Amino acid sequence: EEKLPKILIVEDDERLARLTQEYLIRNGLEVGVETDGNRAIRRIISEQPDLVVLDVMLPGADGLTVCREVRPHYHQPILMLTARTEDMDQVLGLEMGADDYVAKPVQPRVLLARIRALLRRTDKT
């Protein structure tokens, strides 16, 4: 056995989510994919991933609603990764409980480094 950090990607662009998933798996992470916001809420709470990569514009429940609903029962890092790149969007996402806010398109190594920085802070806490 070998327990890797568990990542959940929440992203409704299915191909994009999969390409991101494959990259992160090649870099020492165990990664699942969820494409619906309401499914993501229940899955985050029950599966308790070590970190969530969270899209904002989602069917069922947008990323801000996801944060509101999971944060009472889920305390691990949330990294928002979204095409909603305006300053107000970033402030709102962070104020709603996201620990990082990353603009699409993100360079794969940057996304990986930002994930690792959040996991490091948690593990050192």
Add this chain to the structure above:
Amino acid sequence: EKLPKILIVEDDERLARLTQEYLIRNGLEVGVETDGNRAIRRIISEQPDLVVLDVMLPGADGLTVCREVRPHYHQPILMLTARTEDMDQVLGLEMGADDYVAKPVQPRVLLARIRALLRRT
């Protein structure tokens, strides 16, 4: 009340001051250091709750500052720099920074990122 203590490490003195004044107006206690070697000693001595860290600095660059304070300073470090290449950002985070923000940053974004890091303390 006890305000969060922030240290801005930035060699552009005017920029450091404008950033300082904005953060003070938003409930933070903020000091300014302009030299990298002075920052190392000051960070370890004063133990601010968060450091806003420039990279290109006299005396010691921000990556060196991060390296040398981390054994004695575990609080969040937010790098804020004009070194915006992808390799620069990855290296800064791998060096021990918690966040890496490109200049010019909008003040409200900077404030929100500082608060996001302080939430985790």
